[PDB]
């Protein structure tokens, strides 16, 4: 709730002056943070996905959905309705709580973090980070995990352009290159 109230108390204002918005609803707001973890190696070992889910459930608050394979493909030897990855679609209250914990204490533990890519936008304000390790989040014990399976964070917003959506994140002291 801290970043949530920060948005309303500050930021709501800061963005109004930049793009001379007519109304307060025109300002981009952050909709959902979708944590994906396409484990993939679960074809060989079935438990390996259950280990990844335990890690996502630790990293986020809520428990992840086990995503099925959409179509069968020969390139990786998978079939229709096979559990291939994990996801969490966290939004609302716990979203802002996670979003604080991400930027404020998780990003800084990225190995040799110099600057995050400002050109990593979808052409519609929706940002996508990809973390290499789990260890960067302080929820994982060091002697528990035995495999470097990263996730990828995807911040979805209401902006109609990446330039409009950059300022939104940048206004939360987001480390860009």
């Amino acid at each position: 709730a801290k970043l949530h109230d920060y948005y309303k108390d500050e930021v709501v204002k800061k963005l109004m002056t930049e793009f001379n918005y007519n109304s307060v609803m025109q300002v981009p707001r952050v909709e959902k943070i979708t944590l994906n973890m396409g484990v993939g190696e679960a074809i060989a070992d079935k438990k390996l996905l259950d280990n990844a889910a335990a890690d996502l459930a630790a990293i986020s608050g809520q428990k992840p959905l086990i995503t099925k394979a959409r179509k069968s493909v020969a390139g990786f030897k998978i079939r229709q309705g096979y559990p291939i990855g994990c996801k969490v679609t966290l939004r609302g209250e716990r979203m802002w709580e996670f979003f604080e914990r991400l930027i404020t204490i998780a990003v800084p533990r990225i190995r040799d973090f110099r600057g995050l890519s400002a050109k990593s936008f979808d052409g519609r304000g929706n940002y996508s980070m990809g973390v290499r390790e789990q260890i960067i989040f302080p929820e994982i014990d060091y002697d528990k995990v035995d495999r470097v399976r990263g996730l990828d964070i995807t911040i979805t917003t209401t902006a109609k352009s990446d330039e409009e959506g950059r300022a939104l994140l940048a206004a939360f002291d987001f480390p860009f290159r």
Binding site: R111, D112, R114, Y142
Partner: protein, 115 residues
């Protein structure tokens, strides 16, 4: 047991614990523990948290981990861009310090190949 970029050892003496940092060897590690005012015989489990924060500022003096990796990667990439004898040596995957390249050179050249 979380200083610099990585350093997470346990059941290991302090001097040998800090060798696990990239950019810190055996002699460098003794200079850290001398300046910090910590005995080399103790281990990180035995140490307290008040002492570990003094090690964090001490290793911050020296260039370590990704600061170092980039400094090395810059210097090698510099040579290759010049097109000097060392640069040609680097990109070709052959030994640089005027070494024998006929019989041995297996570390730089890699394992054996067919003809």
């Amino acid at each position: 047991a979380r200083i610099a970029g990585i350093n997470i050892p346990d059941h290991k003496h302090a001097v040998i614990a800090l060798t696990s940092i990239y950019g810190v060897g055996k002699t460098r590690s003794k200079a850290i523990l001398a300046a910090a005012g910590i005995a080399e015989d103790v281990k990180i489990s035995e140490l307290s948290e008040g002492q570990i924060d003094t090690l964090r500022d001490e290793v911050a003096k020296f260039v370590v981990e990704g600061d170092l990796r980039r400094e090395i990667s810059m210097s090698i990439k510099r040579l290759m861009d010049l097109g000097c004898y060392r640069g040609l040596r680097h990109r070709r995957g052959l030994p640089v310090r005027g070494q024998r390249t006929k019989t041995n050179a297996r570390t730089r050249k890699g394992p054996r190949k067919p003809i």
